[PDB]
Amino acid sequence: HHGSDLGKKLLDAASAGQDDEVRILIANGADVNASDTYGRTPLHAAAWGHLEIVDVLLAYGADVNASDKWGYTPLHLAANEGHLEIVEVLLANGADVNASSQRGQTPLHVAATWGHLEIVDVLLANGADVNANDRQGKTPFDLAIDNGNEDIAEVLQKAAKLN
């Protein structure tokens, strides 16, 4: 019964961000790439504010691009939250910068409509595609403007501008 159990045990540690119990459970072999209903992995949970757990989870081979009921990957959630440091580590372990979802939402789309230059910039420096289409018919730029962040609304247009 340790399958579903250890899996849940790690899911709770990552979600509670209990680094030491993370450290143990995986070393003994918790799945890391485990999945509950919905489609959430630990790396999804740890993409909140826990960098060592995000490190260790990738170093034991967690799918760096798992998607859920929705379509988000840990890189999505991180972009939303912020956590520049985690997202740099996500990109470097092979995150898709254009990991899309049932809405057509990329980490760039979420990052300007939740207000965060720093992260949108890294996504940009890292091949983030600017032109893309969220089905609601909204590029990161609409979103950027649409919500409340004119700063980011600027940087997004000059890059597309040279387009």
Binding site: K8, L11, D12, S15, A16, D36, T37, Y38, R40, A45, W48, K69, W70, Y72, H76, L77, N80, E81, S101, Q102, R103, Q105, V110, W114, N147
Partner: protein, 256 residues
Amino acid sequence: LKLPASFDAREQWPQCPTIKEIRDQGSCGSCWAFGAVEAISDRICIHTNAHVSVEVSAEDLLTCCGSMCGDGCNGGYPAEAWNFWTRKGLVSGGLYESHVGCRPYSIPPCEHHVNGSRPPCTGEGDTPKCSKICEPGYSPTYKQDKHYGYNSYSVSNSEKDIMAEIYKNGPVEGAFSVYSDFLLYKSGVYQHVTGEMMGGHAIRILGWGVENGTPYWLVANSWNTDWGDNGFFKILRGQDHCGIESEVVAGIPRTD
């Protein structure tokens, strides 16, 4: 350890109105959200022993989580919603167009598999936006009205550990496999026989009981008073009927 056979939160916590209360999400797939703002209210009223009782805001939770709580009106999950509550706080938010709380709900009500004076629901839908300000005039500000939890967690697949969590700390939340014979539930202890599955939505458990012998979990749904038995429905307690026992989460509020 010992536990009565018919425990009822609304009963042992008579001083806590939000328990008795039933809500409406109106064309949003806010399964998790309403089930959560719902336990975190009776629980806040309980943890302070009714010194404080507030309607925690579905609206807020719904729109201010982000991809970390799912896709707004298209589904979401309690683990992050409850630990979202412990990690960032939720504000006050009574029913639709009601002028109660920092953020009253902003999806109008509707009718869920029932015939009645209100409009017929639009089938899941459109996430509202996330304004972090209150309703003009609501006196204590968004930063000032936030309510934080002290910690967030699951209970185990056993019933005893779920039945016990409600006893010491208050009504808890969960999800379950949905069936069409469930829509149309009016009274008595539901049990699946003829239906297609249709999803897994979240709810709020607040007691249990034995009825006519068939054992069961007392639950509050987010489909409103004319649905079910006034909003409420008993379900099979003991076999993890429809996964109703597989995912149970609860958090304790912040003392002070």
